[PDB]
Amino acid sequence: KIPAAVSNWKNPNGYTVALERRVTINDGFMKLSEALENADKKARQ
Amino acid sequence: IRQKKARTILQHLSEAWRCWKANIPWDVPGMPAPIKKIIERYIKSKAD
Amino acid sequence: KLAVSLQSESKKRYEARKRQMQNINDKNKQFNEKLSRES
């Protein structure tokens, strides 16, 4: 069964369609931010 | 079954091409996997 | 009798489908109903 094609760009016949049809972080970032935070602490102290 | 199904399928093709140009991920829920492969095949050739 | 049977059965099928039909625009709501069948 092929679904009905609803485009987000086109509406040839002007159909008002149901709205719903018209509608993890890598660890390196943590390590980078932690290292920079420690470097800042070193500078302060 | 041909008469209406063809006009439906090629609308999915054209939508896939629009998604490719927009860099939107084309993914139609309940699309059959082989027809999905066929459409992506022709979209990739047009893209190239 | 064969001709009458075909005529009457055609009438019955036709009217039953009419009764089913009678239960923004006509085509737009038919499309929305098709989308409700899809789901």
From Swiss-Prot, chain B:
The lineage of its organism: Eukaryota, Fungi, Dikarya, Ascomycota, Saccharomycotina. It is found in: Nucleus. The gene is PRP8. This is Pre-mRNA-splicing factor 8. Component of the U4/U6-U5 tri-snRNP complex composed of the U4, U6 and U5 snRNAs and at least PRP3, PRP4, PRP6, PRP8, PRP18, PRP31, PRP38, SNU13, SNU23, SNU66, SNU114, SPP381, SMB1, SMD1, SMD2, SMD3, SMX2, SMX3, LSM2, LSM3, LSM4, LSM5, LSM6, LSM7, LSM8, BRR2 and DIB1. It comes from the Eukaryota. The MPN (JAB/Mov34) domain has structural similarity with deubiquitinating enzymes, but lacks the residues that would bind the catalytic metal ion. Contains a region with structural similarity to reverse transcriptase, presenting the classical thumb, fingers and palm architecture, but lacks enzyme activity, since the essential metal-binding residues are not conserved. Functions as a scaffold that mediates the ordered assembly of spliceosomal proteins and snRNAs. Required for association of BRR2 with the spliceosomal U5 snRNP, and the subsequent assembly of the U4/U6-U5 tri-snRNP complex. Functions as a scaffold that positions spliceosomal U2, U5 and U6 snRNAs at splice sites on pre-mRNA substrates, so that splicing can occur. Interacts with both the 5' and the 3' splice site, as well as the branch region. Has a role in branch site-3' splice site selection. Associates with the branch site-3' splice 3'-exon region. Also has a role in cell cycle. Present with 468 molecules/cell in log phase SD medium.
